[PDB]
From a paper:
The PR-[name] complex plays a vital role in regulating H2AK119Ub histone marks, and mutations in human PR-[name] genes lead to a spectrum of malignancies.
With the goal of understanding how PR-[name] activity is coordinated, we have solved the crystal structure of the Drosophila [name]–[name] complex to a resolution of 3.5 Å. Two copies each of [name] and [name] are present in the asymmetric unit. Whereas Rpn13 consists of seven helices that wrap around the ULD sequence of UCH-L5, only four are defined for [name]. The crystal structure reveals that the NEF-motif sits directly adjacent to ubiquitin in a putative substrate complex. Using size-exclusion chromatography coupled to multi-angle laser light scattering (SEC-MALLS), analytical ultracentrifugation (AUC), small-angle X-ray scattering (SAXS), and chemical crosslinking we demonstrate that [name]–[name] forms a higher-order complex in solution containing two [name] and two [name] molecules.
Numbering used by the authors:
A (entry chain A): 44 to 99, 109 to 194, 211 to 257, 264 to 303, 335 to 398
B (entry chain B): 214 to 253, 275 to 309
C (entry chain C): 46 to 93, 110 to 112, 116 to 194, 210 to 243, 246 to 259, 266 to 304, 333 to 399
D (entry chain D): 214 to 253, 274 to 309
The structure:
């Protein structure tokens, strides 16, 4: 087939999922697993290898069950999109509203074979245009193995798009949530590898604005009572400070989104036509660039 | 000159807002018409970027490694 | 005096036995994690130039093995009695040393009996008296952090703030050595009172259930509000229960640290040798 | 044993809650009478798994090995 290589950057993936219609979703980069995050939809893992040396446990699932979204990657350079779709398409529609161009795919491929389910991914044009719309201009062609960790029902499924079978880990203890079982499978590893790990959570702003409602209602419940002539001003003080805290948090979130938008608008632009015209305009008057190495 | 001539310069520092501010307005405007959608004063990071620097480096390399002299009219 | 085990629980029970009720000593694991209103810090080593008027409590430690008492009294007695209620037998000392010379204020420390009995009351039976854990106390009076060293003759000052003091304490961690198993603790007020206060300021909203009915001739389905904030109430409840359980733990470790087990061991072994059931498995 | 009879044992493991549960009640009570004020027939297993209990047994073998506390110890 042939797709475009992409930079691994949480902003690029967030804007990718926004370009997939799935708005109430987000990908933040996790630096340590100990700090908890609320309601993670699923994790994504990335290897690299600088010196190749590679030329890239029997817990596979043998039964021909394709009820879960698993698809062998047939489309090259589609690693990232395949991983994102792997972490999204195996979640609860109750918990999240996925984009219609995504839900159409998820309901289209009911029980399809993976070897052509990934081909169903490759054939969707409104997906290839959005994934290819973020490639750097140096993708003038004519690493980063992705592994998706998502549970379906109390079973932590490690989905590998290149391996033929999905790997299950089957962790269930009624004392711990699945995020506790995810860290136990993080027994990694350590030489010169530029690995990276990201987390797929829902858009934080949706959980923030709701808290601004559930807070500003109590901000609105100010019962000033007069007996015609107890004192809980400190309560409205504390909850008002909370309101300000979440306000600055939300502003930080929208600033992160704007930053990702800037990095995306610069990552796409092809500077060549800009540089030539620039240099000729200097060599017209200011020929002498004495910054030689 | 795109014929492997004086390609060994540090363009990332050569192309700064100061060297940019050494150009007439009716040329700076034509310049920003070739800029990204950050077109709209100048947002100093506009010429200090990872992608802009790697761009200039892939440019001087793209000139030294293989000449893009007028031979380059292949389609 | 007698050496003591360096353990935040031991110091908490020490200050509780000193009448200081609204106090606690927790160990700080990272400076980044903020803690509310720290009354003063204590610094401990294990392997080893700033400035008259000595009206403030900087009593030179003359009594050996009194390091812990020296540090705790150094961080407490330079705070506001308004902010915290220290035991009357402690405040009597605090007012008993108005402008006294430090070089003999520590002798006033040594003379106080309820201090030797309470401080020595927690020593292990192995307190047989016949490089070390040097204590350094950090307490501010007014925006100026004096580093109080009981062995050095003068207290070292580090500077002020900018209003943008706990922030200034981290600024003093630009120290390189060169090899040391140091450790640092923090003197905060008893967490449980700040918990119960939040249980009041929460249970009032738990009590404000404005049930209005539109079934007869902003307000909407807000059951989830009382649900979530009720879960918060339960969270702080479990916090308080964990704290009082920590106090129980300190009481157990204290009741066992003091006990002299030898007389128990003799009777145990002799009760085994009564019916000849020796330890013919374990050895060496 | 005043000075040196079977002092080379690993007492910390010899004195466990099981060997305690191998004693008659009218002796186990006498035993808990020599325990700290955490007295209040079951045994709170952590009662015999402590740093201070082990350090007690070790300073005990030291008090036996290093210098005997035989009736010689009447230097007072």
């Amino acid at each position: 087939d042939g797709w475009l290589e992409l930079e691994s950057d949480p902003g690029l993936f967030t804007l990718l999922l926004k370009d997939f219609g799935c708005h109430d979703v987000q990908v933040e980069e996790v630096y340590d697993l100990q700090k908890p995050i609320e309601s993670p939809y699923g994790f994504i893992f990335l290897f690299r290898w600088i010196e190749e040396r590679r030329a890239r446990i029997f817990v596979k699932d043998e039964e021909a069950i394709s009820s879960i979204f698993f698809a062998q990657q047939v489309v090259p350079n589609s690693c990232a999109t395949h991983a994102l779709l792997s972490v999204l398409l195996n979640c609860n529609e109750n918990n999240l509203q996925l984009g219609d161009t995504l839900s159409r795919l998820k309901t289209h491929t009911k029980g399809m074979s993976p070897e052509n389910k990934g081909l169903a991914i490759g054939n969707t044009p409104e997906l290839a245009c959005a994934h290819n719309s973020h490639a750097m201009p140096q993708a003038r062609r004519r690493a980063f193995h992705f592994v998706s960790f998502v549970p379906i029902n109390g079973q932590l499924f490690e989905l590998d798009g290149l391996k033929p079978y999905p790997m299950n880990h089957g962790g269930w203890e009624d004392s711990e949530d699945w995020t506790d079982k995810f860290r136990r499978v993080m027994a990694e590893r350590e030489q010169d590898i530029r690995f990276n790990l990201m987390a797929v959570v829902p858009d934080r702003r949706i959980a923030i604005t709701h808290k601004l409602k559930m807070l500003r209602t109590n901000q609105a419940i100010v019962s000033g009572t007069l007996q015609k002539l107890r004192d809980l001003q400190s309560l409205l003080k504390n909850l008002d400070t909370e309101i300000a805290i979440n306000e600055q948090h939300l502003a930080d979130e929208n600033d992160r989104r704007h930053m990702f938008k800037v990095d995306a608008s610069r990552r796409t632009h092809n500077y060549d036509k800009f540089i030539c015209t620039f240099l000729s305009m200097l060599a017209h008057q200011g020929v002498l660039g004495e910054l030689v190495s | 000159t795109p014929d492997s001539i004086l390609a060994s310069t540090n363009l990332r520092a050569l192309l700064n807002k100061q060297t940019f501010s050494l150009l007439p307005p009716l040329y700076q405007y034509n310049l920003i018409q070739l800029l990204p959608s950050v077109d709209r004063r100048l947002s100093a990071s506009c010429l200090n970027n990872e992608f802009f620097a790697r761009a200039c480096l892939e440019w001087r390399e793209r000139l030294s490694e293989g000449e893009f002299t007028p031979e380059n009219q292949l389609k």
